Short mmCIF file of C-alpha atoms in Angstrom, two decimals:
data_model
loop_
_atom_site.label_atom_id
_atom_site.label_comp_id
_atom_site.label_asym_id
_atom_site.label_seq_id
_atom_site.Cartn_x
_atom_site.Cartn_y
_atom_site.Cartn_z
CA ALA A 1 65.37 -24.17 7.73
CA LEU A 2 63.65 -21.81 5.58
CA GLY A 3 61.83 -19.83 8.48
CA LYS A 4 63.05 -16.46 7.46
CA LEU A 5 61.88 -16.29 3.82
CA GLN A 6 58.73 -18.11 4.55
CA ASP A 7 57.85 -15.76 6.92
CA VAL A 8 58.60 -12.79 5.09
CA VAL A 9 56.46 -14.45 1.98
CA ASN A 10 53.59 -15.08 4.72
CA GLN A 11 53.71 -11.59 6.10
CA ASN A 12 53.43 -9.80 2.39
CA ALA A 13 50.56 -12.19 1.69
CA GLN A 14 48.90 -11.34 5.02
CA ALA A 15 49.28 -8.01 4.58
CA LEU A 16 47.51 -7.91 0.99
CA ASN A 17 45.02 -10.30 2.25
CA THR A 18 43.96 -8.05 5.21
CA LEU A 19 44.12 -5.28 2.77
CA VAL A 20 41.77 -6.81 0.27
CA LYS A 21 39.52 -7.91 2.98
CA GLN A 22 39.01 -4.22 4.35
CA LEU A 23 36.93 -3.49 1.31
CA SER A 24 33.88 -5.29 2.78
CA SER A 25 33.68 -3.57 6.12
CA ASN A 26 30.75 -0.86 6.76
CA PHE A 27 32.99 1.40 8.33
CA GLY A 28 29.41 2.68 9.72
CA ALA A 29 28.05 2.66 6.29
CA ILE A 30 24.63 1.17 5.94
CA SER A 31 26.33 -1.19 3.42
CA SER A 32 29.99 -1.81 2.05
CA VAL A 33 28.94 -1.83 -1.25
CA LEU A 34 29.22 1.15 -3.28
CA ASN A 35 26.59 0.65 -5.83
CA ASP A 36 24.09 -0.41 -3.50
CA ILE A 37 24.47 2.72 -1.20
CA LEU A 38 24.25 4.69 -4.97
CA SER A 39 21.02 2.55 -5.42
CA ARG A 40 19.21 2.81 -2.19
CA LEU A 41 19.59 6.19 -0.86
CA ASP A 42 19.58 9.82 -2.76
CA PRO A 43 22.05 11.63 -4.05
CA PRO A 44 22.35 13.83 -0.93
CA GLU A 45 22.39 11.02 1.38
CA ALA A 46 24.54 8.87 -0.42
CA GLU A 47 27.38 11.05 -0.30
CA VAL A 48 27.66 11.21 3.52
CA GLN A 49 27.68 7.21 3.36
CA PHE B 1 8.01 31.70 -8.67
CA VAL B 2 4.68 29.97 -7.10
CA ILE B 3 3.92 26.78 -5.74
CA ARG B 4 1.94 25.21 -2.85
CA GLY B 5 3.25 24.88 0.80
CA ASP B 6 3.99 21.36 0.84
CA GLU B 7 6.14 21.85 -2.27
CA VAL B 8 8.43 24.28 -0.61
CA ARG B 9 10.76 21.53 1.09
CA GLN B 10 10.88 20.66 -2.41
CA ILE B 11 12.93 23.16 -3.69
CA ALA B 12 15.91 22.52 -1.48
CA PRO B 13 19.73 21.40 -2.58
CA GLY B 14 19.43 17.71 -3.81
CA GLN B 15 15.61 17.42 -3.32
CA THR B 16 13.28 15.45 -5.23
CA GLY B 17 9.59 15.42 -5.96
CA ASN B 18 7.52 16.66 -8.97
CA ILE B 19 8.38 20.11 -8.41
CA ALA B 20 12.39 19.12 -7.51
CA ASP B 21 12.22 16.74 -10.22
CA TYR B 22 10.42 18.44 -13.29
CA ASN B 23 9.98 22.59 -12.32
CA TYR B 24 13.07 23.63 -10.42
CA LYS B 25 16.40 21.41 -9.35
CA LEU B 26 18.74 23.20 -6.94
CA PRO B 27 22.48 21.67 -7.41
CA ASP B 28 24.21 19.75 -4.78
CA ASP B 29 26.61 22.45 -4.10
CA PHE B 30 23.82 25.36 -4.22
CA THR B 31 25.16 28.22 -2.29
CA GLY B 32 22.44 30.60 -1.78
CA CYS B 33 19.23 31.06 -0.11
CA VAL B 34 15.80 30.23 -0.46
CA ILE B 35 12.82 32.59 1.04
CA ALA B 36 9.39 31.64 0.81
CA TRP B 37 6.36 33.35 2.12
CA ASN B 38 2.66 32.32 1.92
CA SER B 39 0.50 34.69 -0.81
CA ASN B 40 -2.84 33.17 -0.15
CA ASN B 41 -4.27 36.95 -0.02
CA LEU B 42 -2.76 37.59 -3.44
CA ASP B 43 -2.33 34.23 -5.62
CA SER B 44 -5.77 32.62 -4.79
CA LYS B 45 -9.30 33.67 -5.47
CA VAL B 46 -12.90 31.98 -4.41
CA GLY B 47 -13.32 29.55 -7.12
CA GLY B 48 -9.93 28.56 -8.12
CA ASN B 49 -6.84 30.91 -9.15
#
């Protein structure tokens, strides 16, 4: 009965969850954790990642 | 200044090593040139300069 409203809530929740999960992708970087990049590589190298 | 040949690379933006860390460090955004030339005929003597 409440399909229209439940779909809206689910869509918003899905958008937020996808946005948050995007933080863990490497995006081509050696790692998805910023502190790990800072520690492992030198500043000149770390800047690119 | 004067260094040894293997230390020539240490004189570069963001470089590391003894020379870069404790003697002469360039900024990450260095805007300039580095010209190095062997001075074995001027800065070396028999017995050690």
